[PDB]
Amino acid sequence: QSVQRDASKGYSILQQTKLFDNIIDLRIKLQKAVIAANKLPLTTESWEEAKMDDSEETKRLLKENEKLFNNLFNRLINFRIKFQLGDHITQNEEVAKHKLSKKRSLKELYQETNSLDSELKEYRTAVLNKWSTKVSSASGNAALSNLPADVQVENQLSDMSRLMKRTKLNRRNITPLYFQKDCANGRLPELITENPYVFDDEDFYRVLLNDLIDKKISNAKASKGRKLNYSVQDPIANYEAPITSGYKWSDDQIDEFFAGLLGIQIF
Amino acid sequence: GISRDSRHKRSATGAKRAQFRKKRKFELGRQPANTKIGAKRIHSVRTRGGNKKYRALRIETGNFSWASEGISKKTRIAGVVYHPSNNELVRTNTLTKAAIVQIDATPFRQWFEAHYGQTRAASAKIESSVESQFSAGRLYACISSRPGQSGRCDGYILEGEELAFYLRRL
Amino acid sequence: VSENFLEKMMALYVSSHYKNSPNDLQLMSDAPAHKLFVLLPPIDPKDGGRIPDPLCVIQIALEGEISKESVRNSLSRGQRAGGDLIPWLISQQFQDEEFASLSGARIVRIATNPEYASMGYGSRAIELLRDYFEGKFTDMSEDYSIKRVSDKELAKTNLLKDDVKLRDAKTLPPLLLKLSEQPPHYLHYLGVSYGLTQSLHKFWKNNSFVPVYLRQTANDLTGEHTCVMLNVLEGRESNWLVEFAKDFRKRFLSLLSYDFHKFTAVQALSVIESSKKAQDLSDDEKHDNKELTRTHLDDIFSPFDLKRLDSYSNNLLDYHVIGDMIPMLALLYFGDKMGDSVKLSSVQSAILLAIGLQRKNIDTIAKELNLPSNQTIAMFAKIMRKMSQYFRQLL
Amino acid sequence: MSELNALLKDINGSLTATSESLERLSGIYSNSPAEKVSLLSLKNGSMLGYINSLLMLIGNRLDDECKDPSAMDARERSIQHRVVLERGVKPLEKKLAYQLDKLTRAYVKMEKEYK
Amino acid sequence: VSVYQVSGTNVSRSLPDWIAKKRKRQLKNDLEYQNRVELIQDFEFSEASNKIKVSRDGQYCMATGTYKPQIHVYDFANLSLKFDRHTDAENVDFTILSDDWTKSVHLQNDRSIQFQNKGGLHYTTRIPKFGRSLVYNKVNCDLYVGASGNELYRLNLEKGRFLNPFKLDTEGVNHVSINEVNGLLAAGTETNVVEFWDPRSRSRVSKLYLENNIDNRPFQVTTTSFRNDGLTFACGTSNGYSYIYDLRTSEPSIIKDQGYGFDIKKIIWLDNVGTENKIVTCDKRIAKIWDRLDGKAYASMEPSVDINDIEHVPGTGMFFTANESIPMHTYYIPSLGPSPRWCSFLDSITEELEEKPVYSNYRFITRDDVKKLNLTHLVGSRVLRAYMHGFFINTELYDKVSLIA
């Protein structure tokens, strides 16, 4: 019985790991979008001038862009409700079910995201504290009593200023459309190479690509003798004599090894 | 110790003939030469009379003839692909007469593009299968010279019914 | 059910031992430090919970955590308190007070099924045991104390009407506990003690243990010299171990003449090799060997001596002529002063170690390595040629 | 072609491709008592939020108005999610990595035995 | 590490040996010709050599030739050819039954087993179908012959009787090998499976399916070999991948890539030499030495001519290799162990020896395979160090791109 629960736990472990890899595939597909977005204009005047170049086609493209975007992010939010529901991250099952049923607007969609991240933060605090204690006890760190993981996350989130700069770093050297015209016109207050407007997660993106890559590596007729004649053959008779010693291993051992070859409450 | 004497065989009637005389020189046979693809290695043989024979123990190059255009070029042999007598000769890349081998297509392609200026049209037309082989980069040819005896491995590129039949057999 | 298992444990525990005494049973049962660890084959659910057989039985004794006051008072008094063998000995041999404070466990005994010796169960057993203390084993699913006989019960029972009974099964914990169920005790090192033999040392060496001490006087009953080997678990300071290992190696080299001349050349060479592996353990460069300085070389050897070595490298000398200087060469090479320029094969190292340190004759090593005497001297000659060429490079 | 039109096409392809893969992923999760590892559950859930925050960074930019071109709010959420994966989740699972591998191996052996 | 070529051709790979014989008369004046040392006289065949083995006693060696197909036997105690003996057809494999050279069995290529006794050809028998390998079971005196067909033939030397042939599930046996400790027979089938058999009974203890993740291509088991420890087991594939298996568990403990994509021709276990954890996996072009535990390369032998067989003199650091060249090469890696007793003074001349030394360290890739892997964009980069007609990549980086591709 103990075997089965462990085996089932592995399936959940595998399922979560497969779930991890799949979502990275989503991130990989989205990668050309984030680079493209960082190339988009930053200001109303640039966008209108961007539309000015091809007004008709851009309007059609913009209409398709808005539809696909809203459909996608409405769908993602549906998964998050289900995902955080299915995994017990959200405790209010009734509220989660109504949200899935109801269709939401863009303003409404942002609100659920705020709600969803808020719930994950509470779950995050509980989970890290639970496992950090468990790891501590296992290693004897409890006996010793190296910061708690939740505390470490709190400190890094406290240093929000440092890490914002990490995003602002323009490693790829992306120039958004009409960036020079917005700079010359003083339409970019933040700036007045590190660009606040360009977002760079390339290092984070590469590390995810590597980890996915390494895991894949780690897991990965009678004539001419054509009919056999069983007669005695004199010249080869008694050609060599068998050794009386036999196999150096004892027979029972040899029999044993072959069998396994190729693979009070006591417990 | 190989012999070609007809005495050790049985008669037509089935009688087991007795040994008349010890083995003689004029009834000699020598060990076979298992020609293989590899750096040209030839061992000479002093045969009956002043004549001489060359054994092609290893060889990589041969003269091959395109009969349709009546041309001959020296080409490298890539490997044995099919051999009518036995297939374990096909496996070990053993080279012998009638073997079907794959030869490099470069010089024939060069000659063709030179002579006809194509990669007028009617003459330049060639069999579709041969053209596909050119696109592949290797051509199917049949060895027509006995490597064991003369020491060379010349042959001809397959074509027509030859080519259809052997491609089917492949 | 427990008793059936205890008999199986003693069978494995007693099999290897030459002559076991019944004290050790009391020793296992009552000692608070001692713990017992059993490797078991995979359990088949079809077996209906039959009392399984033990393949490898390990007994560990927790030791250390000695106050820096007590060690000094005892060391000056020269008195050895009972227990804590490895701390007290290593404290004496090195006069280090910091080691006695560290928390460690001595592997009192390891035994495997003799029918199954030499197939990797014993090694597997140690590998898990280290992982148990290191902290790898954790429970993922989100008490084992037994209530003692209360004083109230003792007063309410009379000698005549005492009903002495086995403890009720609900009270008793399970016989076998999964590693994750029981937390470990925090430890810095794991130590062993065993008579030095080629097989055993090869086993310990493969398990990443490091020698730190070797008793000079062979045990009378066995003819073997007691050896102590230490290992440091991941995540703990490793400096103190490395200093001992370096210090021991120097001690071993000089003593090869005195009382370890008996050891086979290969056997002795292994001991140095095992200790050197400790150096590779420390990826730091704070402690490194120092190459021979030109001033140091002049004090060790006179220029004529270097010339004399040079002549031998050119074959213009008899072998006996250079007999004087070899032992000094041996210490410099095995002290690693010579540096990266001079490196030798295993056969050459054994030959040099023999003549230089064991003080054995060339003829004896020719037998001991089963080589012709002529080939031995030749291989020796190439060694001097490398050393001579090096001394030329320094100059 | 305008630079925007080529870019807008690039986004259009991604959003379609991402949506279809999401549709596949939602089906398999919907297809799935089995209890999951909470730490890994957070790990998946957190990085899901990271993608959402990235999309809000895309969404903020895609707007022609561009009231928040820096996408500071979307940045902070991506910042919050990224930290948990790198600083919190990763050290713990490395400690737990040994026991994880043992269990997954155990099932695969049983699954091999069953077949 | 230092590898010395005691004997063997020392010309360019492009230069064939026979011209060196023609150059030999012209270069007689050259001093190096006088100084060069040949260890065994006539240690050479007319055109090529097929197999090489050393008698158990340690004083005699035997070899086979291409034309005229012949059988040298070398006497180490005299550093000389003892006798050459011609045959009817070229050799495919043989074994030396006796401890000395006197007693041997040779499986030719015309499907005939010839029993060579000391005097001369004793008896010639024929197996039903073509043979590919030959092993001898000292315990039962039963000689086992691999065959193109499924059935694995059995010949009993004691009884002088063909016995019931074993029946394999698949057709084609490329190599057979008998574990000394246990008697387990391993049969290397053409398909990617190795079938184990019990000799005392006649059964199939189990079949191991070889799985390579890197390359989806089909591969054939070409060689097998049991270590004296009686537990570990080695396999070769036609894709140039050498596996080390602990028999008990189905998973491959280590997979090492030779990287030239050539079939593995022999595996030798260097346990006897000391520092037991080493192994040799010999290819058509390279014989690499590496350690069984870590997989790190120890030494490599890179002869100028194709390797057909390699042999290790027990208890010593010497290696013989039968090549497609006129001379058979002899190597000597001093680090492994002492020179053999008969080569007592080989150490003396080490400096005069050639001392031959990237190619073993990295994985070789053809131009076409680069296209298959979409690595064209890196051509000219420091990752791709081009040699000959192909490009070298780090083995780890090769594993990465292949799975992605």
Curated annotation (Swiss-Prot), chain B:
Main location: cytoplasm
Residues the record lists as Phosphothreonine modifications: 61, 106
Compartments (UniProt record): Cytoplasm
Chain positions with Phosphoserine modification: 65, 68, 72, 85, 128-129, 132, 135
GO molecular function annotations of the record: structural constituent of ribosome
PROSITE patterns named in the record: RIBOSOMAL_S8E
GO biological process: maturation of SSU-rRNA from tricistronic rRNA transcript (SSU-rRNA, 5.8S rRNA, LSU-rRNA); translation
Disulfide bonds: none
Pfam family, one: Ribosomal_S8e
Record region (Disordered): 1-30
CC per GO annotation: 90S preribosome; cytosol; cytosolic small ribosomal subunit
Keywords carried by this UniProt record: Cytoplasm, Phosphoprotein, Ribonucleoprotein, Ribosomal protein
Assembly and interaction partners: Component of the small ribosomal subunit (SSU). Mature yeast ribosomes consist of a small (40S) and a large (60S) subunit. The 40S small subunit contains 1 molecule of ribosomal RNA (18S rRNA) and 33 different proteins (encoded by 57 genes). The large 60S subunit contains 3 rRNA molecules (25S, 5.8S and 5S rRNA) and 46 different proteins (encoded by 81 genes).
Function: Component of the ribosome, a large ribonucleoprotein complex responsible for the synthesis of proteins in the cell. The small ribosomal subunit (SSU) binds messenger RNAs (mRNAs) and translates the encoded message by selecting cognate aminoacyl-transfer RNA (tRNA) molecules. The large subunit (LSU) contains the ribosomal catalytic site termed the peptidyl transferase center (PTC), which catalyzes the formation of peptide bonds, thereby polymerizing the amino acids delivered by tRNAs into a polypeptide chain.
Curated annotation (Swiss-Prot), chain C:
Annotated localization: Nucleus, Nucleolus
Residues annotated to bind acetyl-CoA: 110-112, 117-123, 206
Residue ranges of every copy of the N-acetyltransferase domain listed in the record: 38-173
Effect of gene knockout: Leads to a strong inhibition of 18S rRNA synthesis. Deletion results in an altered alkali-soluble beta-glucan phenotype. Heterozygous mutants show haploinsufficiency in K1 killer toxin resistance.
Subunit organization: Interacts with TAN1. Associates with 90S pre-ribosomal particles.
Function: RNA cytidine acetyltransferase with specificity toward both 18S rRNA and tRNAs. Catalyzes the formation of N(4)-acetylcytidine (ac4C) at positions 1280 and 1773 in 18S rRNA. Required for early nucleolar cleavages of precursor rRNA at sites A0, A1 and A2 during 18S rRNA synthesis. Catalyzes the formation of ac4C at position 12 in serine and leucine tRNAs. Requires the tRNA-binding adapter protein TAN1 for full tRNA acetyltransferase activity but not for 18S rRNA acetylation.
Family assignment from sequence similarity: Belongs to the RNA cytidine acetyltransferase family. NAT10 subfamily.
Protein known as: RNA cytidine acetyltransferase
Annotated organism of origin: Saccharomyces cerevisiae (strain ATCC 204508 / S288c) (Baker's yeast)
Residue window of the full protein shown: 529 to 928 of 1056
From Swiss-Prot, chain D:
GO annotations of cellular component type: nucleolus; small nuclear ribonucleoprotein complex; small-subunit processome; sno(s)RNA-containing ribonucleoprotein complex
Modified sites of kind N-acetylserine: 2
Keyword Ribonucleoprotein among UniProt keywords: yes
Main location: nucleus
Compartments (UniProt record): Nucleus, Nucleolus
Top-level taxon of the source organism: Eukaryota
Protein's GO biological process: endonucleolytic cleavage in 5'-ETS of tricistronic rRNA transcript (SSU-rRNA, 5.8S rRNA, LSU-rRNA); endonucleolytic cleavage in ITS1 to separate SSU-rRNA from 5.8S rRNA and LSU-rRNA from tricistronic rRNA transcript (SSU-rRNA, 5.8S rRNA, LSU-rRNA); maturation of SSU-rRNA; maturation of SSU-rRNA from tricistronic rRNA transcript (SSU-rRNA, 5.8S rRNA, LSU-rRNA)
This protein's UniProt keywords: Acetylation, Nucleus, Ribonucleoprotein, Ribosome biogenesis, rRNA processing
Function, in words: Component of the U3 small nucleolar ribonucleoprotein. Required for the early cleavages at sites A0, A1 and A2 of the pre-ribosomal RNA. Participates in ribosome biogenesis.
Misc. remarks from the entry: Present with 1430 molecules/cell in log phase SD medium.
Protein name per its UniProtKB record: U3 small nucleolar ribonucleoprotein protein LCP5
Organism, scientific name: Saccharomyces cerevisiae (strain ATCC 204508 / S288c) (Baker's yeast)
UniProtKB/Swiss-Prot annotation, chain E:
GO biological process, one term: maturation of SSU-rRNA from tricistronic rRNA transcript (SSU-rRNA, 5.8S rRNA, LSU-rRNA)
Location of this chain's protein in the cell: Nucleus, Nucleolus
Official protein name in the record: Ribosome biogenesis protein ENP2
Gene (name only): ENP2
Range covered out of full length: 11 to 418 of 707
Subunit structure: Component of the 90S pre-ribosomes.
Presence of keyword Transmembrane helix: no
Family from the record: Belongs to the WD repeat NOL10/ENP2 family.
Start-end of each WD repeat: 44-84, 168-207, 216-255, 259-300, 302-341
Keywords annotated in UniProt: Nucleus, Phosphoprotein, Repeat, Ribosome biogenesis, rRNA processing, WD repeat
GO-annotated cellular components: 90S preribosome; nucleolus; small-subunit processome
Role description: May be involved in rRNA-processing and ribosome biosynthesis.
Keyword rRNA processing: yes
